[PDB]
Amino acid sequence: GTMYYGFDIGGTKIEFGAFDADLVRVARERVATPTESYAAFLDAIVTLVNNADAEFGVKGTVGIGIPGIADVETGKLLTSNIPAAMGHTLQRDLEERLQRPVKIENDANCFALSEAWDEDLRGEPSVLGLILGTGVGGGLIFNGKVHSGRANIAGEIGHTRLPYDALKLLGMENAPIFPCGCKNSGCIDNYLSGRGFEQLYDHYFSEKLSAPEIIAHYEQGERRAVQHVERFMELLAICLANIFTCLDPHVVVLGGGLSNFELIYQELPKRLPAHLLHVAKLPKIIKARHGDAGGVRGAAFLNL
Amino acid sequence: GTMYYGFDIGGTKIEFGAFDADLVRVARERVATPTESYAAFLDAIVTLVNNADAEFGVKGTVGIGIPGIADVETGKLLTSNIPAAMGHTLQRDLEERLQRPVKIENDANCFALSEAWDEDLRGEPSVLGLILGTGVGGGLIFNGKVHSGRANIAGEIGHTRLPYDALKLLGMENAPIFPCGCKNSGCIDNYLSGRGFEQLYDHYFSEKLSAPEIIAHYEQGERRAVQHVERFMELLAICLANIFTCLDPHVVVLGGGLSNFELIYQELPKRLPAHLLHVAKLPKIIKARHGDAGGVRGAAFLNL
Numbered sequence: 001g002t003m004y005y006g007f008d009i010g011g012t013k014i015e016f017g018a019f020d021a022d023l024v025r026v027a028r029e030r031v032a033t034p035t036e037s038y039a040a041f042l043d044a045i046v047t048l049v050n051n052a053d054a055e056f057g058v059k060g061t062v063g064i065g066i067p068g069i070a071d072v073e074t075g076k077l078l079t080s081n082i083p084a085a086m087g088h089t090l091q092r093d094l095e096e097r098l099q100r101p102v103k104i105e106n107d108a109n110c111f112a113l114s115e116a117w118d119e120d121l122r123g124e125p126s127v128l129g130l131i132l133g134t135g136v137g138g139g140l141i142f143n144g145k146v147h148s149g150r151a152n153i154a155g156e157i158g159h160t161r162l163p164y165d166a167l168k169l170l171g172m173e174n175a176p177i178f179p180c181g182c183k184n185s186g187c188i189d190n191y192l193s194g195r196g197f198e199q200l201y202d203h204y205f206s207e208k209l210s211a212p213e214i215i216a217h218y219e220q221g222e223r224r225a226v227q228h229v230e231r232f233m234e235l236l237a238i239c240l241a242n243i244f245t246c247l248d249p250h251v252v253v254l255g256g257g258l259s260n261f262e263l264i265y266q267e268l269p270k271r272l273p274a275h276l277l278h279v280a281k282l283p284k285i286i287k288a289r290h291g292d293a294g295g296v297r298g299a300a301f302l303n304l
Numbered sequence: 305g306t307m308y309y310g311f312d313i314g315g316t317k318i319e320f321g322a323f324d325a326d327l328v329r330v331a332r333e334r335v336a337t338p339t340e341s342y343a344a345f346l347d348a349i350v351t352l353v354n355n356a357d358a359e360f361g362v363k364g365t366v367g368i369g370i371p372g373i374a375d376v377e378t379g380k381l382l383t384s385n386i387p388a389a390m391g392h393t394l395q396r397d398l399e400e401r402l403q404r405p406v407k408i409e410n411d412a413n414c415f416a417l418s419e420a421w422d423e424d425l426r427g428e429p430s431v432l433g434l435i436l437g438t439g440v441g442g443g444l445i446f447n448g449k450v451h452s453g454r455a456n457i458a459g460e461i462g463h464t465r466l467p468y469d470a471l472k473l474l475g476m477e478n479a480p481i482f483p484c485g486c487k488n489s490g491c492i493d494n495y496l497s498g499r500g501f502e503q504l505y506d507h508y509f510s511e512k513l514s515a516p517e518i519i520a521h522y523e524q525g526e527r528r529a530v531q532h533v534e535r536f537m538e539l540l541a542i543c544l545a546n547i548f549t550c551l552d553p554h555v556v557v558l559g560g561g562l563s564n565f566e567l568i569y570q571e572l573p574k575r576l577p578a579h580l581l582h583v584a585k586l587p588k589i590i591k592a593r594h595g596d597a598g599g600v601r602g603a604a605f606l607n608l
């Protein structure tokens with residue numbers, strides 16, 4: 001039988017998953033992300049493939065989802081989330097030290113592919129998978145196929161700069177201009193992420209709270225948190241309206257930590273129309289149907 | 305046999321074209337854009353279909369390209385460029401008068417489809433057709449098919465707001481914030497168009513010159529025009545790099561009046577790398593291969 005393996009490699013932990021011909025998840029393991037050695041990164045992955053090869057008596061197709069980009073020419077990763085990985089040719093290493101073809105894909109692309117494979121979305125002309133978590137990431141699907149881009153950068157909406165209307169909301173020349181991991185400044189990755197949410201609160205209120213704690217205070221109706229959340233929802237709507245005016249997606253699926261903030265699903269539909277073109281219609285906006293598993297599933301499904 | 309008609313309806317004139325089984329253009333007419341009634345708009349179009357039906361002894365497939373958007377639900381056109389058309393159910397009114405299926409498409413979408421049908425681009429995974437003219441328009445092609453969007457708004461990059469790095473180039477709180485036809489403000493349609501090029505020159509130098517005259521003065525090395533052009537090319541690179549970080553197109557084809565400013569093909573490749581991600585690669589950037597005929601050809605090729 002056909003087995004499909006998937007890996008979701010994150011900053012803090014690696015997640016492994018195995019799916020059978022019916023796509024039933026028959027294995028799930030989480031090891032910590034080995035950092036400060038790349039010998040140790042590599043090992044963790046080939047470890048899990050091997051264990052699983054034995055345990056099911058086969059060697060199945062392999063897919064990897066990682067944050068950042070495999071250079072379309074050299075094969076080397078830009079991934080400032082994973083110190084241990086950066087600069088290496090991850091694909092090639094695994095491809096021989098495993099005796100079979102390895103597919104590699106950006107994490108947001110895996111997420112979008114996982115969500116779009118749902119029966120409900122499979123025939124939509126376009127799907128945008130948006131991760132609002134550690135960073136801001138996008139996966140573009142057109143007629144069921146990932147658009148990965150000339151250099152594997154398609155959907156890197158997190159490294160676009162705040163638009164004018166967002167800057168105006170945040171005070172124009174007084175707006176906080178956050179530095180970015182890509183080395184540019186004012187990229188939305190640092191505003192609409194969970195970390196961006198926290199940095200914004202701290203900028204206006206001079207207190208170093210976590211997103212969950214701000215949100216808890218919001219649910220208690222506390223004044224600063226209510227003001228922060230109003231500002232954040234308007235900022236989110238402005239930024240997304242700019243993106244939707246370019247992409248006009250049929251369905252937008254949200255993932256990552258902030259996708260669990262339920263107010264988003266109420267506030268986005270109310271706030272987007274003001275920033276969209278007058279003749280625009282709202283996309284269908286939905287919370288991820290597979291929770292946190294999109295990375296693993298999409299990585300495995302690269303070899304469907 | 306098989307004839308294909310195409311119409312390119314602009315602000316100033318309507319252009320008609322007819323193509324045979326081999327795609328040889330056997331007819332070309334240009335009538336003025338009737339704007340004092342919609343009775344007169346409609347007429348101009350049905351006129352030319354009829355003439356051509358007779359003269360070739362057949363009535364073939366019909367495609368129309370127009371600036372703006374036919375409502376994906378009702379059929380009604382938003383085009384503030386064409387007063388006479390706005391609000392009406394253009395498709396239906398023509399689908400009966402001629403007794404056959406009539407396809408309608410945005411002008412930038414037709415342009416991109418016309419360029420993408422070139423043998424050179426036919427198997428490119430993506431093509432962005434970009435019009436820099438009266439306004440700024442984009443046509444998105446993925447694996448050879450137009451992405452028209454949830455509400456026919458895909459590629460409306462002209463109605464995205466200037467990014468932070470563009471505002472910084474133009475002086476931040478001192479940057480000119482131009483009003484837009486869509487009723488938002490700071491849309492790039494009013495900066496990167498031929499009219500935007502003119503308004504920026506006038507903002508900094510208080511003289512009302514046309515784009516051609518500014519460009520002529522640039523070619524003479526004159527101080528103000530050289531300063532303006534340097535600023536404009538940097539603004540163009542910044543805005544496009546933001547868009548390319550989202551879309552990552554394999555090929556970018558430029559059309560419209562400003563696409564004849566040859567300096568763009570030299571300066572864009574030099575200036576884009578600074579504003580793209582470090583791992584990004586330049587798209588193939590090319591001047592339209594069919595000159596000013598993309599509207600007509602793409603409109604005709606809707607039925608291909």
Ligand SMILES: CC(=O)N[C@@H]1[C@@H](O)[C@H](O)[C@@H](CO)O[C@@H]1O
Pocket residue numbers: 067068069078079080081106107108109131133134135136137138156158159181182189
């Ligand atoms: C180059 C880079 O680090 N960009 C990443 C992006 O690839 C990822 O999809 C997103 C969400 O995880 O976070 C970041 O914005």
Ligand SMILES: CC(=O)N[C@@H]1[C@@H](O)[C@H](O)[C@@H](CO)O[C@@H]1O
Pocket residue numbers: 371372373382383384410411412435437438439440441442460462463486493
């Ligand atoms: C809403 C609107 O009028 N947008 C148009 C766009 O449709 C067109 O493609 C572009 C280029 O011609 O100019 C404008 O930006």
Ligand SMILES: [Cl-]
Pocket residue numbers: 509528
């Ligand atoms: Cl001066």
Ligand SMILES: [Cl-]
Pocket residue numbers: 533534537571
């Ligand atoms: Cl220059």
Ligand SMILES: [K+]
Pocket residue numbers: 106108109137138139140153154155156
């Ligand atoms: K992506």
Ligand SMILES: [K+]
Pocket residue numbers: 410412413441442443444457458459460
């Ligand atoms: K368009």
Ligand SMILES: [Zn+2]
Pocket residue numbers: 158159160180181182183184185187189
């Ligand atoms: Zn960035």
Ligand SMILES: [Zn+2]
Pocket residue numbers: 213217
């Ligand atoms: Zn507290």
Ligand SMILES: [Zn+2]
Pocket residue numbers: 462463464484485486487488489491493
């Ligand atoms: Zn606008």
Ligand SMILES: [Zn+2]
Pocket residue numbers: 517521
């Ligand atoms: Zn002069």
